[model samples]
Target: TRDQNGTWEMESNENFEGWMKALDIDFATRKIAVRLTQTLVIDQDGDNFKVKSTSTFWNYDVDFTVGVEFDEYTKSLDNRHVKALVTWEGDVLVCVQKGEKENRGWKKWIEGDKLYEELTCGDQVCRQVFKKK
Candidate 1:
């Protein structure tokens, strides 16, 4: 089985700046966000999930249950309020954010010893990979 519990370290990220721009993030924050390395700590128990992204620049934590809707305010990331729904499609966990922006969402999955994530907004897509730590 695919086990995605515990901590993960950022390996590589691509097109993150573009995705940030799509979310209307300010230039100052984008610059710092792009340069910072992130650590993801994830804990899962059946349908309940807790995911936290930590960095020197910012930290974001989210808790939700699969198939249930939750209110999400992306504080340090975009400072936007949105209704989010997460579901599992195969081994990937997909989150859809419904708010002011169109086509905003993220998908994460485990590939061997690495965790892969893709963030999308408008037409911009950011792909990130992390190694299990």
Candidate 2:
């Protein structure tokens, strides 16, 4: 099985403001998040997984099993409920969130020794890369 188990810190985030804007996140939160340094912890245990994003302004944590659709509330990101499904496409773990928004989800993959995530909502896409630390 492919393993994405690691402690990672943000190296770069691309156009994250547009992502927050599409979700209609508050200006205060987006402002802080735009400049925020994030810590991501991913635990891939067999088919069960847990991911946590930690920052000074907000923290988010979610757990789910692979190939199973589950309810996910974006407590810190946007504060919305969505049906999330996780699937594997080659080496990348892709999550498709079905909800109020037209398109929403993220993709997680490893490039060499780095972890990368591409978050999408509406027409906005944010690519974030992290370094194992």
Candidate 3:
């Protein structure tokens, strides 16, 4: 997903795992994730989409159109809820999750042959870069 204008995919697998692990989830949770397949369901209506990420053990859903405001729930991560809003910065999809942790959120952008995702919780920040398959 592009923040403001374009699209990108992750470039590194290890970074993705690190980000997931950094959330302080238990081994069981991690194991489930490692073995499970995640599916991104996007319902596009014009320039907006209702996106849902589904897994065998958990599901995360967000409804957003470019330049619109919405909420997000990261049910598995910390179980700490937040009200989130997403906007496009040029072509990058920038999401600011407002909650207990200051500067807690994520940004998604596309670079040369790669998609980069940066997730932040409190002072802990994890970066994941992926390449298109």
Best by TM-score: 1
Q: Write the per-residue lDDT of candidate 1 for residues 1-133, one digit (tens) a residue.
A: 3357989999999999999999999999899889989999999999888999999888789999999999989887889999999998998999999999988999999988999999999999999999998
Candidate 3 backbone overlaps, count:
19
| Quality of model 1 by C-alpha lDDT | 0.92
Candidate 3 structure quality by residue, lDDT tens digits, 1-133: 3422222232343444455566667877777675554444445556676766556777777677666655656765667677777777777777787876677777766676566667776566666665544
Residue 38 C-alpha lDDT in model 2: 88
Ranking by lDDT: 1, 2, 3
Q: Write the per-residue lDDT of candidate 2 for residues 1-133, one digit (tens) a residue.
A: 2678999999998999999899999998788889988899998888999989998887789899999999988886778899999989998999999999977999999988899999899999999999988
Which candidate's lDDT is highest?
A: 1
Q: Per model, state how many residue pairs clash.
A: 0, 0, 19
State which candidate, 1 or 3, has the greater TM-score: 1
Give TM per candidate.
Answer: 0.96, 0.95, 0.64
lDDT of 2: 0.90
Deviation from native of the Cα of residue 79 in model 3, angstroms: 2.8
True-vs-predicted CA distance for residue 86, candidate 2, Å: 0.8
**Model 3 alpha-carbon drift over 4 Å, by segment:** 1-24, 30-46, 52-59
Better of 2 and 3 by lDDT: 2
